[PDB]
Design an enzyme around this catalytic site. Sequence first.
Site, PDB file in Angstrom:
ATOM      1  N   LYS A  10       0.829  -1.207   0.000  1.00  0.00           N
ATOM      2  CA  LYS A  10       0.000   0.000   0.000  1.00  0.00           C
ATOM      3  C   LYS A  10       0.868   1.264   0.000  1.00  0.00           C
ATOM      4  O   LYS A  10       2.041   1.245   0.373  1.00  0.00           O
ATOM      5  CB  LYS A  10      -0.954   0.034   1.189  1.00  0.00           C
ATOM      6  CG  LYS A  10      -0.332   0.354   2.535  1.00  0.00           C
ATOM      7  CD  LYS A  10      -1.400   0.522   3.618  1.00  0.00           C
ATOM      8  CE  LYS A  10      -2.064   1.885   3.615  1.00  0.00           C
ATOM      9  NZ  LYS A  10      -1.146   2.951   4.106  1.00  0.00           N
ATOM     10  N   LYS A  15       7.670   1.093   0.625  1.00  0.00           N
ATOM     11  CA  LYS A  15       8.218   0.380  -0.531  1.00  0.00           C
ATOM     12  C   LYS A  15       9.508   1.023  -1.035  1.00  0.00           C
ATOM     13  O   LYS A  15      10.518   0.337  -1.228  1.00  0.00           O
ATOM     14  CB  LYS A  15       7.204   0.322  -1.677  1.00  0.00           C
ATOM     15  CG  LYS A  15       5.932  -0.446  -1.384  1.00  0.00           C
ATOM     16  CD  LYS A  15       5.046  -0.514  -2.633  1.00  0.00           C
ATOM     17  CE  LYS A  15       4.625   0.844  -3.131  1.00  0.00           C
ATOM     18  NZ  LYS A  15       3.936   1.656  -2.065  1.00  0.00           N
ATOM     19  N   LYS A  41       4.314   8.647  -8.197  1.00  0.00           N
ATOM     20  CA  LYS A  41       5.085   9.604  -7.404  1.00  0.00           C
ATOM     21  C   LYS A  41       6.446   9.912  -8.033  1.00  0.00           C
ATOM     22  O   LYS A  41       6.933  11.042  -7.933  1.00  0.00           O
ATOM     23  CB  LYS A  41       5.239   9.058  -5.984  1.00  0.00           C
ATOM     24  CG  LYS A  41       5.291  10.077  -4.852  1.00  0.00           C
ATOM     25  CD  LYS A  41       5.069   9.346  -3.528  1.00  0.00           C
ATOM     26  CE  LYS A  41       5.291  10.245  -2.323  1.00  0.00           C
ATOM     27  NZ  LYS A  41       6.720  10.261  -1.886  1.00  0.00           N
ATOM     28  N   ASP A 129      -2.073  -0.068  -4.414  1.00  0.00           N
ATOM     29  CA  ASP A 129      -3.400   0.235  -3.878  1.00  0.00           C
ATOM     30  C   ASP A 129      -4.515  -0.210  -4.824  1.00  0.00           C
ATOM     31  O   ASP A 129      -5.643  -0.450  -4.381  1.00  0.00           O
ATOM     32  CB  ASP A 129      -3.517   1.724  -3.571  1.00  0.00           C
ATOM     33  CG  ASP A 129      -2.351   2.239  -2.736  1.00  0.00           C
ATOM     34  OD1 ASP A 129      -1.264   2.463  -3.309  1.00  0.00           O
ATOM     35  OD2 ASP A 129      -2.499   2.372  -1.501  1.00  0.00           O
TER      36      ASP A 129
END
EC number: 1.18.6.1
Lengths: 272, 272
Positions: A10, A15, A41, A129
């Site tokens: 998630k 990560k 991101k 997600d």
Amino acid sequence: AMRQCAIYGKGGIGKSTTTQNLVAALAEMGKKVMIVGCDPKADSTRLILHSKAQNTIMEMAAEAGTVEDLELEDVLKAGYGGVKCVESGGPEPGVGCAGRGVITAINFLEEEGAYEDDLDFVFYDVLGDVVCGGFAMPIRENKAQEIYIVCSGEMMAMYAANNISKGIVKYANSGSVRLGGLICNSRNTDREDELIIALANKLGTQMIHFVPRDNVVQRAEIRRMTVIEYDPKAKQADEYRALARKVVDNKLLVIPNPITMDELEELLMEFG
Amino acid sequence: AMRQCAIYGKGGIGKSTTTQNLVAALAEMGKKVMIVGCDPKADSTRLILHSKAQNTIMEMAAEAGTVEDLELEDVLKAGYGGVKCVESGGPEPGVGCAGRGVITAINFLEEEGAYEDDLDFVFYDVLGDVVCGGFAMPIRENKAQEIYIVCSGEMMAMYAANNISKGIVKYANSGSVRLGGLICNSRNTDREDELIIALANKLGTQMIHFVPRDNVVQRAEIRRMTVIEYDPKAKQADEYRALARKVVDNKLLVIPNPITMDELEELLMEFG
Ligand SMILES: Nc1ncnc2c1ncn2[C@@H]1O[C@H](COP(=O)(O)OP(=O)(O)O)[C@@H](O)[C@H]1O
Ligand SMILES: Nc1ncnc2c1ncn2[C@@H]1O[C@H](COP(=O)(O)OP(=O)(O)O)[C@@H](O)[C@H]1O
Ligand SMILES: [Mg+2]
Ligand SMILES: [Mg+2]
């Protein structure tokens, strides 16, 4: 050969921090490694490059005209330990499928010969997600043979781990994508290791390592570094070195057994 | 009239808990409210229904043949305070777009006349880790006029807030979707309220309320209840009552000003 692993989990679970520190420890052992950022991101390589982030394949292809005008030497950048780094990118929010850049990037890297026989490991850092679009493509298209899931005692984190496992089972009849293990990224709570061990056992896999919560991670990331580079004597550096050894030595790759919501709830009650 | 609001934010931040407790407090004031679950977890109504979850429109349409064979009275369920509840659902992981159920559900509810003039509020509980597919459709298609974002001092939570804000700006030339405010769901850390106030000011909006971290929430959810129903005298119940009053009274709805990664980093350094 070369091992192709993908890290899922998630958002905000750790990560990118765990992957970059793991990869630095592998390069410190003399392994040749590539990191492929597959999260919109686009910060999955900043600690290896000592950078703010990295410009993405999607942005560079639009500046150059087409992806064919890009060369591999313009997109791939080398950082700490000679680790090679690339970012997929993705469309802006509300426009187009957030995973579309992943498909573009992985195909570019394959055709441009990025998968040279001297590489030992390639790591994909993948948003987990949702499991659809380009974020499922490493599983659907057999690009990541070993999946490692970062989680913690958080309900949402274990739910994401179960959802990723359902996607692995969906595609078990083709290719060879398998679950390699769970990595617990601690929230510094009691019995958390035992929780994640119990979850892994129920899935049919293992907890490969428990990563402690340590403020040295923030002090290193402020300076755009892995803990491995920032403070090689830190206790936290030895944790990432231990994770790297276990990933290199891991031989258990399974088709997982997803659990029900009731089993998940029972786990959380039991371990208080 | 009736106000149509959508709650967005990263996974695990507290969207479903805050939304259900807010809605219970509104019903406690005599408002008529609908909750529409738009997250694949499908647990956005369980605390109003005292249930394990709710069966989804996608699952019921497949059991009945087509969505046209469904009637509204079979899909909508009434819980605490007469709050009406429905869940969209979505495809299984790795198959099809995770947001596809949202489009199916909202269109079903519109055509079946669920938007009756006696409703005062409709709340959509929407996954915000990606802004695409059916998860962008409340913004793209002008279904949610007021967006409220749940966040906390966590970097990833504030990054998600900024990504949702970019999607609102993308579609500003059509319909009337606007950002109504930020809701801080505390991680019990110092200066957190001031952090989120500073972020809201930079976006052009406001922090509408600060929700404390309180263990009574877990004790209520274990019994499948809102805190409003579980312990109406709890201090935490008055917090949700205060949030409800402020949402009812809120008049500031703006097109936000998304910030850069450097501004975000500066915020976190400043507030330590
Ligand atoms: N073991 C740890 N100890 C302390 N902080 C951590 C640890 N792992 C991650 N973090 C912090 O958690 C935040 C999110 O981590 P990140 O790797 O960006 O998450 P993701 O990539 O899963 O969204 C970052 O601020 C990172 O510095
Ligand atoms: N204010 C709070 N105090 C204590 N626990 C909370 C609070 N808000 C949320 N939680 C807990 O956080 C977890 C995730 O909340 P949830 O509403 O399911 O997140 P989301 O819907 O954003 O994924 C749940 O266990 C919930 O009980
Ligand atoms: Mg990341
Ligand atoms: Mg939820």
